[PDB]
Amino acid sequence: YSERLFEPDTMTITGNPKAVCYKMDSICDKVFALIIGEVETLNANPRTSK
Length: 50
Known about the structure:
It is found in: Virion. The protein is mainly beta. Helices cover 0% and strands 16% of the residues.
């Protein structure tokens, strides 16, 4: 019961094998991210992976 969760909440960015945003940013009313590029394979944890 306790926890308070989520949303309808599915928002993808462009998709594709995806990518990782080093930094997602927040500033008034308009917040967003940059992505360097695409980490490889389908699924990779960038900070640990490559």
